[PDB]
Amino acid sequence: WNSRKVGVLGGGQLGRMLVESANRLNIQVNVLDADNSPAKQISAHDGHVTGSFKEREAVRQLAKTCDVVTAEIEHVDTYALEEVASEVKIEPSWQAIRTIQNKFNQKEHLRKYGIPMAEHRELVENTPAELAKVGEQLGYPLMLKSKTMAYDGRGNFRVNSQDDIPEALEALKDRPLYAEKWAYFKMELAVIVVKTKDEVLSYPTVETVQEDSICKLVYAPARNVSDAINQKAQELARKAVAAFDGKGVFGVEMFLLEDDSIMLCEIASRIHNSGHYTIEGCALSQFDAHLRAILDLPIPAQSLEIRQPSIMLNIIGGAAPDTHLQAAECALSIPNASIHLYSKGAAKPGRKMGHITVTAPTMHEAETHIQPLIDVVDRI
Amino acid sequence: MWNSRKVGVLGGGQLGRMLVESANRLNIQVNVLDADNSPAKQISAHDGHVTGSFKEREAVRQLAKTCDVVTAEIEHVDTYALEEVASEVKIEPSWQAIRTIQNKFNQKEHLRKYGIPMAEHRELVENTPAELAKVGEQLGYPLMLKSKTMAYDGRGNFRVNSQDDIPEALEALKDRPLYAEKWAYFKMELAVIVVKTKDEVLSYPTVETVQEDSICKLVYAPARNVSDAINQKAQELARKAVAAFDGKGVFGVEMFLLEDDSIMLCEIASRIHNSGHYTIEGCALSQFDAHLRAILDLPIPAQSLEIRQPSIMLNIIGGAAPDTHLQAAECALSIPNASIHLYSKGAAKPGRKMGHITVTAPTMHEAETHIQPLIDVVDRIR
Numbered sequence: 140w141n142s143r144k145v146g147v148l149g150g151g152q153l154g155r156m157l158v159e160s161a162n163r164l165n166i167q168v169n170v171l172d173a174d175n176s177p178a179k180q181i182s183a184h185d186g187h188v189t190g191s192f193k194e195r196e197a198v199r200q201l202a203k204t205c206d207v208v209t210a211e212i213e214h215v216d217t218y219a220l221e222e223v224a225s226e227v228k229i230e231p232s233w234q235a236i237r238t239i240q241n242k243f244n245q246k247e248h249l250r251k252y253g254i255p256m257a258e259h260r261e262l263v264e265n266t267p268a269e270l271a272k273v274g275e276q277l278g279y280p281l282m283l284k285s286k287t288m289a290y291d292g293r294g295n296f297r298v299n300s301q302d303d304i305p306e307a308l309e310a311l312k313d314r315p316l317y318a319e320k321w322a323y324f325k326m327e328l329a330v331i332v333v334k335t336k337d338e339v340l341s342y343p344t345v346e347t348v349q350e351d352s353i354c355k356l357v358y359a360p361a362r363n364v365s366d367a368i369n370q371k372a373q374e375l376a377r378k379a380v381a382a383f384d385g386k387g388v389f390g391v392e393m394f395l396l397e398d399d400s401i402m403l404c405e406i407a408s409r410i411h412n413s414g415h416y417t418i419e420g421c422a423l424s425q426f427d428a429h430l431r432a433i434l435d436l437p438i439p440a441q442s443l444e445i446r447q448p449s450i451m452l453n454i455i456g457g458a459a460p461d462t463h464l465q466a467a468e469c470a471l472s473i474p475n476a477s478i479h480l481y482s483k484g485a486a487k488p489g490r491k492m493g494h495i496t497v498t499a500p501t502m503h504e505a506e507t508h509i510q511p512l513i514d515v516v517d518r519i
Numbered sequence: 520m521w522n523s524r525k526v527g528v529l530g531g532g533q534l535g536r537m538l539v540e541s542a543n544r545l546n547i548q549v550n551v552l553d554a555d556n557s558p559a560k561q562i563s564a565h566d567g568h569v570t571g572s573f574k575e576r577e578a579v580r581q582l583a584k585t586c587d588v589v590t591a592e593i594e595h596v597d598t599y600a601l602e603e604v605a606s607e608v609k610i611e612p613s614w615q616a617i618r619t620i621q622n623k624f625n626q627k628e629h630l631r632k633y634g635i636p637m638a639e640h641r642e643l644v645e646n647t648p649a650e651l652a653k654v655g656e657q658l659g660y661p662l663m664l665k666s667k668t669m670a671y672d673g674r675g676n677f678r679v680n681s682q683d684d685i686p687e688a689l690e691a692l693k694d695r696p697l698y699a700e701k702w703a704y705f706k707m708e709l710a711v712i713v714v715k716t717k718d719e720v721l722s723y724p725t726v727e728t729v730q731e732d733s734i735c736k737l738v739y740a741p742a743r744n745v746s747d748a749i750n751q752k753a754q755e756l757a758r759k760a761v762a763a764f765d766g767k768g769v770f771g772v773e774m775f776l777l778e779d780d781s782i783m784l785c786e787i788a789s790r791i792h793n794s795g796h797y798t799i800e801g802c803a804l805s806q807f808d809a810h811l812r813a814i815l816d817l818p819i820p821a822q823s824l825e826i827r828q829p830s831i832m833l834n835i836i837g838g839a840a841p842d843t844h845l846q847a848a849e850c851a852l853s854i855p856n857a858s859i860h861l862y863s864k865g866a867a868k869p870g871r872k873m874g875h876i877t878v879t880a881p882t883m884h885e886a887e888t889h890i891q892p893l894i895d896v897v898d899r900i901r
């Protein structure tokens with residue numbers, strides 16, 4: 140069962156956690172990324188392919204040596220993937236990844252399936268006049284969005300008023316964009332879905348908190364949220380994921396609106412930051428679940444249940460190249476703190492350097508244990 | 520710079536591997552001393568590892584020259600090279616400790632003065648039936664004939680039902696230093712994992728262990744059906760045993776619970792032990808996380824070794840077939856809340872510890888129910 144070889148496009152922390160799981164199962168993983176990547180570092184064998192998963196020919200080498208190829212990002216060359224689909228299984232599917240990696244197309248496909256979402260207008264002209272018109276239809280503020288290559292919200296620009304139109308466009312020059320109606324959410328939610336060969340399952344709904352457009356915190360499960368909203372959100376995520384072909388873990392972002400209704404923010408065709416808490420909080424982490432789904436191995440549902448309330452805090456670079464080691468050093472003394480350093484090295488501000496996951500029998504207790512670290516992070 | 524230190528591990532097996540697993544999470548470098556491609560090395564792709572044996576003087580010397588601290592994943596190492604190197608590298612736990620622990624007759628003779636309860640025993644100065652018998656005549660039958668040295672998985676012990684048994688005994692444990700212990704009729708076996716640090720002595724809760732063909736099979740944590748009085752008594756015994764040795768690190772203590780509720784020591788392991796594998800999922804800080812911090816003087820918050828939910832651990836022991844462990848692993852895939860750990864040792868040999876499965880649940884009763892089918896399976900295959 141475990142003699143197959145899994146190829147992973149990307150060798151960052153996501154790829155790494157993934158390799159932690161395969162290692163557990165003695166399943167070989169061949170990472171395609173820079174030599175030395177966080178993920179090649181815990182997997183000492185010769186099967187790895189050095190290069191970019193944006194580069195056609197490497198992806199080609201990866202493929203020809205693997206039984207299944209998967210990705211640890213949604214910005215991979217799905218055309219290069221399309222080429223080898225003859226040679227190797229690809230999961231999830233490259234069409235699904237293709238639709239998904241372009242934020243506008245993902246939304247329009249989803250619309251066919253009736254998924255609650257924020258209204259938007261594709262921007263064909265990229266002229267301040269075109270945008271003014273949208274503004275009139277959608278109102279301010281508006282969230283100007285890049286369709287592709289999007290992450291950490293570096294390709295998004297909040298347009299508060301007709302007057303920011305120029306800064307917005309200068310900000311997001313040379314890209315296809317769409318403008319989306321503003322989501323007045325009271326909380327951001329996320330659900331990790333496991334799409335298998337036969338079913339679509341999900342972990343419980345959690346609460347995500349981004350600072351500076353970057354994920355800073357996750358509370359699992361979501362604080363002050365009725366089991367119903369929880370289910371609803373889950374139920375929604377599963378349905379949105381089902382509109383895709385292929386297997387594996389999908390990260391689903393959502394918005395909790397003031398009336399407690401739910402809208403989809405965006406889907407990620409791969410294991411995702413919101414789910415790192417499953418390492419310590421559930422029987423099978425999303426990494427475990429991903430491997431299993433793409434190789435058709437059983438996935439008991441109770442294994443995706445949350446064992447104890449957990450709170451995950453990302454370690455993000457600050458200006459000083461050690462800060463991440465500062466957060467971690469502090470972490471060493473937080474009770475019930477589980478520390479994950481990414482072995483990326485020296486920090487660049489805003490880079491994801493590691494994460495700390497804290498558990499306790501109750502959320503309150505967990506919040507109490509981690510505050511001091513949260514504090515340290517804020518201050519420094 | 521706390522995690523910039525380098526850790527040398529004498530031994531690259533499953534235990535060292537799990538140690539590496541912890542070091543990896545803290546991004547701490549570990550230089551493994553063992554054969555190329557050993558389990559621990561496989562998840563550690565750097566060029567610092569040492570190729571050779573933990574029983575080998577110079578290899579041990581070489582490794583030492585390469586790190587800040589040397590620790591071990593096994594008891595059977597050259598404590599004479601470590602003594603040679605003590606002025607060059609910190610070694611934790613102490614080489615003297617491992618030196619004493621590695622010889623079981625010496626370990627127990629050391630503990631006798633610290634007043635630890637244990638079985639009566641007699642060293643065998645000659646491995647002559649003539650000798651074994653007079654011994655037979657001193658502690659009665661049946662008795663456990665045991666090699667003081669290179670012991671594991673009972674691969675060095677023989678139960679001696681009686682005199683007719685003798686010759687077999689000697690032949691099985693031929694050309695080894697031996698000792699003989701009076702039989703211990705326990706009503707159950709228990710173990711406590713202890714951690715010695717620069718300023719404290721911590722411990723995990725007591726668990727119930729179950730051996731089969733003298734190899735550890737399962738672990739129930741905490742121990743089922745043991746009064747509160749018993750766990751304390753157990754915790755104390757263990758901690759008392761540990762205290763008789765110097766060094767920082769994790770130690771495992773195996774005890775016997777007798778019919779009358781008294782506990783006697785079975786053996787103490789100078790390092791991470793099978794009894795604690797459940798800590799990976801049962802606690803915030805695993806025994807492996809604990810060991811690394813202890814030896815590096817890093818904080819170990821106490822609440823981090825408290826158990827989160829009941830758990831049961833089961834070892835995947837090889838059988839006649841060298842792929843059966845995959846069969847157990849494979850059945851595990853379907854057990855609810857079962858976390859599979861496979862060691863990457865290759866084809867199985869009989870009795871080899873191939874990997875382990877850990878199942879947790881809000882209650883032991885539920886953990887047991889989940890696990891049963893897996894047990895049923897492993898047993899079929901025995």
Ligand SMILES: Nc1ncnc2c1ncn2[C@@H]1O[C@H](COP(=O)(O)OP(=O)(O)OP(=O)(O)O)[C@@H](O)[C@H]1O
Pocket residue numbers: 257281282289290291292293294295319320321322323327349352392404405
């Ligand atoms: N219409 C909107 N209204 C309000 N807030 C929005 C809107 N779109 C985005 N946001 C805020 O922007 C954040 C980042 O948006 P998004 O997830 O769409 O960007 P990204 O670059 O895709 O991020 P990621 O790092 O997750 O790939 C959201 O998590 C939410 O906080």
Ligand SMILES: Nc1ncnc2c1ncn2[C@@H]1O[C@H](COP(=O)(O)OP(=O)(O)OP(=O)(O)O)[C@@H](O)[C@H]1O
Pocket residue numbers: 638663670671672673674675676700701702703704708730733734773785786
């Ligand atoms: N006197 C004794 N009476 C009865 N059983 C005994 C006795 N000594 C050992 N055993 C049985 O043998 C089991 C394994 O023996 P022991 O730990 O001494 O050997 P070992 O080779 O050191 O094994 P390991 O290091 O793998 O634990 C004990 O757990 C116990 O159940």
Ligand SMILES: [Mg+2]
Pocket residue numbers: 289290291405407
């Ligand atoms: Mg995104």
Ligand SMILES: [Mg+2]
Pocket residue numbers: 392405
């Ligand atoms: Mg997002």
Ligand SMILES: [Mg+2]
Pocket residue numbers: 670671672786788
């Ligand atoms: Mg032993």
Ligand SMILES: [Mg+2]
Pocket residue numbers: 773785786
């Ligand atoms: Mg033992």
